[PDB]
Enzyme design. Structure first.
Site, PDB file in Angstrom:
ATOM      1  CG  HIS A  76      -1.970   1.268   1.235  1.00 42.83           C
ATOM      2  ND1 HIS A  76      -3.001   1.243   0.687  1.00 42.83           N
ATOM      3  CD2 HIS A  76      -1.613   2.729   1.735  1.00 42.83           C
ATOM      4  CE1 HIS A  76      -3.653   2.475   0.642  1.00 42.83           C
ATOM      5  NE2 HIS A  76      -2.619   3.197   1.295  1.00 42.83           N
ATOM      6  CB  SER A  90       0.066   6.719   1.372  1.00 43.11           C
ATOM      7  OG  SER A  90      -0.761   7.699   1.384  1.00 43.11           O
ATOM      8  NE  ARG A 136      -8.891   6.975  11.275  1.00 45.87           N
ATOM      9  CZ  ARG A 136      -9.282   8.015  11.938  1.00 45.87           C
ATOM     10  NH1 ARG A 136      -9.751   8.999  11.576  1.00 45.87           N
ATOM     11  NH2 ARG A 136      -9.093   7.792  13.323  1.00 45.87           N
ATOM     12  CB  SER A 163       1.323  -0.123  -4.019  1.00 44.63           C
ATOM     13  OG  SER A 163       0.243  -0.881  -3.537  1.00 44.63           O
ATOM     14  CE1 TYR A 209      -2.297   3.392  -7.078  1.00 48.82           C
ATOM     15  CE2 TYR A 209      -3.680   5.436  -6.549  1.00 48.82           C
ATOM     16  CZ  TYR A 209      -3.683   3.829  -7.406  1.00 48.82           C
ATOM     17  OH  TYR A 209      -4.351   3.723  -8.246  1.00 48.82           O
ATOM     18  CD  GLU A 261      -7.144  -2.014  -8.588  1.00 52.17           C
ATOM     19  OE1 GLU A 261      -6.870  -1.071  -9.647  1.00 52.17           O
ATOM     20  OE2 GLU A 261      -8.175  -1.509  -7.922  1.00 52.17           O
TER      21      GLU A 261
END
Ligand code: 8E6
Length: 350
Positions: A202, A204, A218, A244, A247, A328
């Site tokens: 993941h 970010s 979240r 990922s 992102y 995904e």
């Protein structure tokens, strides 16, 4: 300096609590920092801005009452103040534009959580700020040793799932951290009974990681648009590190990004080849798998700690007629995720 932590953990702390990075993000969004400073961000203002972009998106989908759209667009920019210099505000009148502003608010919320953590507390201590701000993450953070099986598996995971096609980068793992957020263990315990637990990526933005570590991954709120969530509002993971890594929004500017490895309790997967906004899963299903054209070779599936790791090389899947290059995985309950590792990666753009 006066801190007990190993230098990689200290640098991680400096990197995620970096106020200059927060302000730079706001400047790059062209936010007017005179009318809305870093210190005056509000959850309530951002929630209201989310709602407006949802109304914008609705207005687009129906049939642009072109002045009501402009009325909504204007209301957004009144609520979130911008300084575009010589140009005009870009009209929020299409899906791609709404999605970019939604991503901005996501970012702003995590930045606000980071800044509130940073300023919160008494603001005077015998301990140095690194150790003190480390404590506010409520996350035990340890360095994984390069010569461990976990470092090796994790480095192989990165190597094999780096997609040598539309990749403008080689990937290099700088640090591997083992992480345990407070309360993840007890919240996740029931879901440990589900079959098909997988170790998945993941990504970010770096300015989101103070918020992610304090609050966990979240689900987007109801106020926020669903645009760009191919499978509805949930928590998204990939089995291909490059999927990922996109992102992380890393640039030749800042070629360092942070990426998570999560243990996610998938259970029976609702398997889909095309976009479909999910609000409730069928009975008996506990996750969605978006079916990609390329999937990790199941021969080379391995385990650490009873969690499957699909580090196989990218091969072909038996799936024609799909909109997805890579798989995904989506879960719709925050308690189905157990964050296990945090990687600091260097993006080597070619
Ligand atoms: N982070 C990931 O690793 C990730 C991995 C995937 F395989 C699919 C993903 N889809 C998303 C997001 C979609 C939107 C976001 S994040 C912000 C608001 N607009 C839509 N993230 C992933």
């Amino acid at each position: 300096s006066k801190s007990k932590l190993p230098k990689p953990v200290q640098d991680l702390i400096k990197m995620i609590f970096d106020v200059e990075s927060m302000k730079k993000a706001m400047v790059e969004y062209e936010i007017d920092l005179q009318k809305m400073p870093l210190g005056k961000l509000s959850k309530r203002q951002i929630q209201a801005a989310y709602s407006i972009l949802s109304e914008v998106q609705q207005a687009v989908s129906q049939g642009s009452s072109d002045s009501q759209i402009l009325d909504l667009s204007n209301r957004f920019y009144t609520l979130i103040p911008h300084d575009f210099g010589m140009k005009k505000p870009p009209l929020l009148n299409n899906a791609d534009s709404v999605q970019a502003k939604a991503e901005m608010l996501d970012n702003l919320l995590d930045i606000e959580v980071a800044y509130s953590l940073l300023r919160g507390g008494s603001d005077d201590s015998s301990k140095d700020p690194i150790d003190v701000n480390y404590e506010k993450l409520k996350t035990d953070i340890k360095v994984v040793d390069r010569d461990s099986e976990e470092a090796e598996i994790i480095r192989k995971y990165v190597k094999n799932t780096h997609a040598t096609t539309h990749n403008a980068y080689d990937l290099e793992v700088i640090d591997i951290f083992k992480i345990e957020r407070e309360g993840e263990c007890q919240r996740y315990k029931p879901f440990k009974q589900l079959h098909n637990r997988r170790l998945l990526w993941h990504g970010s933005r770096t300015t989101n990681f103070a918020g992610i570590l304090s609050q966990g991954l979240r689900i987007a709120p109801p106020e926020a648009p669903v645009t760009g969530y191919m499978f509805g509002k949930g928590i998204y993971f990939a089995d291909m590190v490059s999927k990922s890594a996109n992102y992380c929004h890393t640039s030749q500017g800042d070629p360092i990004g942070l990426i998570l490895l999560g243990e996610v309790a998938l259970g029976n997967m609702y398997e889909l080849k095309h976009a479909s906004h999910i609000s409730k899963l069928p009975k008996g299903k506990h996750s969605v798998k978006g079916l990609g054209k390329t999937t990790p070779d199941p021969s080379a599936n391995i385990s650490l700690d009873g969690v499957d790791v699909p580090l196989g090389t990218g091969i072909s899947s038996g799936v024609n007629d799909t909109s997805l290059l890579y798989n995904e995985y989506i879960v719709y309950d925050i308690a189905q995720v157990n964050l296990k590792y945090l990687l600091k990666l260097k993006f080597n753009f070619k």
